[PDB]
Amino acid sequence: FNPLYVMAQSGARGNPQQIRQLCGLRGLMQKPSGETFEVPVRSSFREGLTVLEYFISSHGARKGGADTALRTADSGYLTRKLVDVTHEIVVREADCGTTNYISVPLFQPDEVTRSLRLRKRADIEAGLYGRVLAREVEVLGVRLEEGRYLSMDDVHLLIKAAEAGEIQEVPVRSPLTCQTRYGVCQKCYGYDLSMARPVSIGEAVGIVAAQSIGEPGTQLTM
Amino acid sequence: SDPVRQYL
Amino acid sequence: YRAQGVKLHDKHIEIVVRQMMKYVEVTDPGDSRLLEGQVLEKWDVEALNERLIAEGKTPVAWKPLLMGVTKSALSTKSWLSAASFQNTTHVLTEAAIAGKKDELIGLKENVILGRLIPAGTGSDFVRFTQVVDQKTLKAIEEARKEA
Amino acid sequence: RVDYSGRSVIVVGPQLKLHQCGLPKRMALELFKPFLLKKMEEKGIAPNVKAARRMLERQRDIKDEVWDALEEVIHGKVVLLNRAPTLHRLGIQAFQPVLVEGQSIQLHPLVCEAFNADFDGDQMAVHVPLSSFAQAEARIQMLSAHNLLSPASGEPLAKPSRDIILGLYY
Amino acid sequence: PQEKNSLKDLVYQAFLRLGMEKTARLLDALKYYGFTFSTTSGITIGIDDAVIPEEK
Amino acid sequence: AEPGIDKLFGMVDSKYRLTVVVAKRAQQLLRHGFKNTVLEPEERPKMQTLEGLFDDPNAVTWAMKELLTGRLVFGENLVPEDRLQKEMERLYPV
Amino acid sequence: PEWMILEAVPVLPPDLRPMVQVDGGRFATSDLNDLYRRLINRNNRLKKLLAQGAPEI
Amino acid sequence: MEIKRFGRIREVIPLPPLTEIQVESYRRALQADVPPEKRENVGIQAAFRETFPIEELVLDFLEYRLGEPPFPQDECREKDLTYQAPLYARLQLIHKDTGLIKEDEVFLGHIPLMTEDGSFIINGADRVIVSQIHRSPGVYFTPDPARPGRYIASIIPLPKRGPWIDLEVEPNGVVSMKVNKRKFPLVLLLRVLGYDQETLARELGAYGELVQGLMDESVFAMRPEEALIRLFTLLRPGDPPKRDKAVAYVYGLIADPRRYDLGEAGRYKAEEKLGIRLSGRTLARFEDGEFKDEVFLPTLRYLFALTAGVPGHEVDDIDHLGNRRIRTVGELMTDQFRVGLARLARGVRERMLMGSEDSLTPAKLVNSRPLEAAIREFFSRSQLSQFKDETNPLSSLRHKRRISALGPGGLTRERAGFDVRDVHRTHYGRICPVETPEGANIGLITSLAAYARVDELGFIRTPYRRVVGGVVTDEVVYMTATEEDRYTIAQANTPLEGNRIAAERVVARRKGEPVIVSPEEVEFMDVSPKQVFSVNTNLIPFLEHDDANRALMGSNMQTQAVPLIRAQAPVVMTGLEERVVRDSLAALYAEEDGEVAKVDGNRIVVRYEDGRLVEYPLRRFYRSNQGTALDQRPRVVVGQRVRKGDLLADGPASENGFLALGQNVLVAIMPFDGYNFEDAIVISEELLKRDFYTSIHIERYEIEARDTKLGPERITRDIPHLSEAALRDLDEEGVVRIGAEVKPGDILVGRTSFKGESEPTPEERLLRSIFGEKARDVKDTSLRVPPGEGGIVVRTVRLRRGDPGVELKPGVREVVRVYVAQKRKLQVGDKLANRHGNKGVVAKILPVEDMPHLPDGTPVDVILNPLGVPSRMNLGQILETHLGLAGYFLGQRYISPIFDGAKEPEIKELLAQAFEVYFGKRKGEGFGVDKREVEVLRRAEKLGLVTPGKTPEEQLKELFLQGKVVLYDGRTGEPIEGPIVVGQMFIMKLYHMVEDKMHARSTGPYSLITQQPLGGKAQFGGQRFGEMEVWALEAYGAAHTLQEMLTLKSDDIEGRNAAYEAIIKGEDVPEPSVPESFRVLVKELQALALDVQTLDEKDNPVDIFEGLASK
Amino acid sequence: KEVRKVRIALASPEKIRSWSYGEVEKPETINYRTLKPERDGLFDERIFGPIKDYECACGKYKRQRFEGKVCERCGVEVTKSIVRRYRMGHIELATPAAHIWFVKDVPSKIG
DNA sequence: TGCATCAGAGCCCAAAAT
DNA sequence: TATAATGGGAGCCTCTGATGCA
Ligand SMILES: [Mg+2]
Ligand SMILES: [Zn+2]
């Protein structure tokens, strides 16, 4: 029930590396060049640093602050480019009628084992959830029909089916293959992810894509 | 390229 | 994004990549008016080729073209869209020579004009929808019966 | 730049329902001012619109019935709150305003993540949708309580965090 | 114990099964009690709360 | 959350069409002074003043409640626009 | 193609390049007016040098 | 009260004068106190010597003098005048033919004087000139990014004092020189200097393959005249190669000390790098008719030696603080002075042709306007000339010590990458690693370290103690980064007994690299931990326990602290807070020993040893640049014996001479019902009751009455159509009376303006006719209190035309200023912060009965959420709170120095003595442990906080040593289920206050061309709904909301008018029309000769100008 | 009619002259004494329209009963002053001049 | 035909700007 | 409206695309 532990464990605040700097050691710090100092900071913020430890640490802090500062502009420009390219894409009809689709792989070829292994859950969820099935799929004695929006439950079923060797990829409607002019169609798009349900015709889908990709931009590296 | 230089 | 722990649906990235793949380059003109090396939207050459192949003419031979988001954005059919992006003089001189007509298909064009955008409540799909109460509905119906 | 808009410092409002915000009354009187002039005429507070406006001009001439009139004016209406940078569409959300004494806008805890808002001195902008159409769009499409899941991941956006998680965990 | 992940799943599941209006109601409830218990819980941070392991 | 929003989204093929129907109905109510309403005296949305209960002034609140009743019919090409406008003014002048 | 060469040069409406008295009675004006003035001066001088049979230099 | 100070480190020297970087720089520039014959050639003097003699008649410079200021400082601020001195120069005009000499002293205008504290007064406002970091002039060798085995030699002079030269070994093998973007073979330039193949072959032959790339037969064939003409034709194509013209150009490029100036620092660095001695600051000389080389051959020798890998040759680290120097006030100002002087010289030569070549004086020859303009431009419009930050005294002291890499002659913000923003190892002891801006300027704006000083050459030096044998001397040597790199320097905390190093292994730096070392290897030792950080950073107690990212905010936020009427110094100080007040110049001290004769609110009279009676007037309620009140209060009483340096008056934000940026409040660290959420702060109404965090603010309002073509503006009490209610507080003349309370809408100064000629509309004709009242000739232009402002009127200044001592700008009859003051209580939305980077806005003010309270009935002041600590890693605030708890009960304050502070055992010791006062008292008063205290103890032993089996008293003491106490919820009476951390924390009210930021607009002013709303609160502006906001409305599909933003709520003129009219009539808003800025766009494209046509579905023109623009 | 399209095209010297309500023959802006616009200059009311609604410059015709009238004395049309945002003038060049967009935008269109 | 070199194109938002 | 006068002056990033040389 220690406060630090509880905050970290619950996800209320804190993460292990921050707690380590408080109760543990601060650890290795890097020079302005990126090269790491040989001597680490053995102190923790509870014990307190030495002016030399503190000074050795400032380099990385500053580098981080500068990273961050130079990133928000680069991300912003990126976002604006994305907006300009996708703005016209809107959901303009229910079905374009295409027979084309994309097959989302459930297995990534592993180089080190040189055999197929299961893709990570979140990766599969990001490619499957809310998609209309392009072809009929029968796995584990269940009929997932053509034209079915995949619920998150449906996705978990396909993952369990893949673990059982029943299915290695899923045929799915996608904006890549949509034939609607100046936009996509309801089927190729899928769920309006915010409503957990089929997208409404008229949703400005291109803008939402640019905003979705751009918002985390400041969280990447630089 | 320099209008003054040319005129001179 | 995954490395940073950012859950983001492929669907959105696909919308963008699709815009990246929007254009093609003519390899052979066939019986059309097009030129070798001329770049145009994939939609338009597919439409042209079904008009030629249904007309009994040699179709245009074309090649897939991949362009980055900046170039693709600058190449879009809408000149109000392209000129408000970037490279304004270049976009505007080529548009003005060609006598380009902006059809106001996308969002930026209408925003510049202060128009009602073609999305949401502005979509032509829901825009014209009427509401009427049952009293007035039957009242109108009886009026139409007496003619 | 737009009319019928304002800005102030934001402050947390734990007591708010998810569809609410604290809106300072002095801000609300300006943002809705024309509506308030009309309402001040229906009730007898002023002979007409011209007299009503002249009475609101001096702050010492403002009596207590106009505050009650303003409550009537804003009834059922929502305003838009915006925080820069507006990175995605949840940078603007609609709230039904609850008039407050004081000069700070009160923001609901659950929407802080989507706005990336915190209480270290952040400010937000307020907007008044004017028409029935605009007000309908705000209440149906943009209302905070109606947008609970991320358009990007499909995961919950408005969710327990920080102190909320902490109590429940304990 | 309810934490960030279990509580996120709860909101999502409630959205699917009960819809927006009830999930909105559920969130305010979770908000109310979470805040309430957090104040009386006796969560604080003193310097002795950063506990150096003997293993260091 | 707006009362019965999940049911309101049930009624339409596109959430945006609900917004159009709500907005247009509210304009009808305002133009005709609420006297074309499909609500019954006890169903009227109410607002608490210092005096006491009064009618909710808000036409968008009204329009959504009306929609939930089932008494409103919405769609495309239900009736010529002028004919609708004239029939509404005959039934409820301004 | 010859329209890419100008004979008549358009002059923007004045309210879009204003000359305004600010608060203090001082004047504030748009930069285009100075650019137009440079143009007009050189053009008029060109008309005069032409009328007077100036050398080609 | 008692002050207990910790730490064993004895610092042999005090902090330097903190503003000396400003004061000394400018003193050296003006050389005002030096008698002219004794002036060095530097600053203003050096500028004159550079510009003169002006050859063409010859005008020569003798000497300059500075007069006294026409008005004192206080007067300048009052009258919106610049504090400045008259500059004169004795000049002699000579006719070289005749011999005639006329000599005269000409008046050159005024030069601004620096006040005592290192600032300027420019047009009434206090300004600071920020020092600029930049590349030191000199000769550098950097690696060529394209070709790895090659290097670039860069010869850099002072800014604007010459071209940069780049030496490269091209892939073809010939050594190229790049000047003003043109490249040629360097061999040609060597031949002009008079070098021959014999000398060059023997000199550079040692480096095998390179010397042959230098050999070009054709160049050696031609004599120095042909090589010089050849070079001129290469550098200036198309310019006829007259032999005198070529000499002139090349001389100006290389040997001219007027057109080419290496620094004095440039000269030393070159001499030191290349191992030679320079006769001057030029790369070569013109001597005995030819050019004689100085620099080029030594740089070429080093360049080849580097490419070949000869031992002793290095590339240069350009971010090293040996190669980076500071340009202070004197240098910057002198530079602009030199510019104005060059322009004035142009006028002299131009005047030396025209007029009579016979009768001319220096007064007739010199027009000083160019010089006055250059100086006036620098002080008002330069980027390095900034509005002084005087929010609190520490604000301006910090402003004077800031270092910018921006400004004229420096980096842009996008062109500045990581390398410049980095904390270089050489920043140690020189530039603070902490205090820099968060955001885009990070690493570009920095702060001088506390013990740092800028040498005469402009390099930052830091003190170290000499260590001989194992003995630490008291002699301190100030070192540059280059000299610091020679030695092995021990840390300041290395143990000493007497002067001897007491450790077998010491912690030192060699070239910044940390290393463990024997006392025999120790050449120097740090003076103090204080020397690594800025002054603001040095004010944060327990800084060693705070992550640097939060200390950054802590430093910076002390700058934003508002002076409080009750301000107190913190209970945990670092020991710098007295010096800061003294160097700030806010506080008043006694000159010599003496006795106090008189003490007033307005003045203090002191009788010194000399017998002389000195009177000190006190600045009372004066308005700073940021509107905080600067006011001095007498701290002594009549008949008090004072010594030299004893405090007389407290300035703003000081308490008995200690820096007071805030209050010491009782804080509980615990969540509270979500009012604490995400950094919000909960405070007790007791804080307002006792006037903690209350601050005085003064706003200045101004109005002019001027002559018009329509008649005079008049400042008058007679204002058309206003009730006596409206005019009540205006005097006879129309100015609001001192002491009146003014609220928004109220008239401050009454004014009438003559109505612009207009024909009243037929409606007004009929209205005027109906009521039978003549329309007045004048309109009400009166100055009123803006929305949200107001207070008590404390001052009025009225200046008319034609009254003694005052002359206004042309056309202005009279000017009125009204000073309005307000006492501001802390409120919801105001921002608080501590020195550790904890910052939050006040979200809730609870009544005292709801506040968590101690068993003995004491409510806490502030409730801070613990969730703010762990991610931020600033634990110093926790230690401050614990030590603050002990001090609350012991009635004492502490001085805990940075990195040598109070440690945990000592704080526990104090906590034990404190517990005796908090508890032992109760047991004697006849009360035992509370039932609820037992319950809290139960949960606490379940938490492992207390040892099981001990008495209730023993367990409470165990918690108290952990800084936790039992706390009662004032709402219920039941305890908080666990023991909570409570103590005294130092918290400041920052300058960001909701009163200033709250704004709203229905309709208002629109812009001239766009017809869109203006921006900003001061203009009654609208919010900007920008590109990204539009995306948001688009992604929501809110088309009508968006369309409103784009038309009716902005530049749709017809639409916005119709919307307002509809709302006041109760109708719904009409359909929008074309936005006016689209019409502007069409017309702007027509001005560009493009025809933009709006078309219908039939492709027929649609006229959006509605017939108005077509004939 | 409703706007469905926006065309952009090059403008002939003829079209530029058809836009123009007058030629600006003088660099003058406004009179230093009267502050009224200088005739034939950049602000001329005879070219770009009246400064005040339905009022000519010299003030012979001051109200909307004359709309479209051009004062014989002052030369100004009596209309809404809004037209000073709309009406274009022109400068008649003594030598043709190239429009730089079609020169410096690579590859040059003229080139 | 394949490859340097250079000219020209860009580089977050809102607040504020004393 | 007339001694003769005859050639200027300042200067310091990354990607993409066209153009000018092996
Ligand atoms: Mg913040
Ligand atoms: Zn499709």
Ligand SMILES: [Zn+2]
């Ligand atoms: Zn006239």
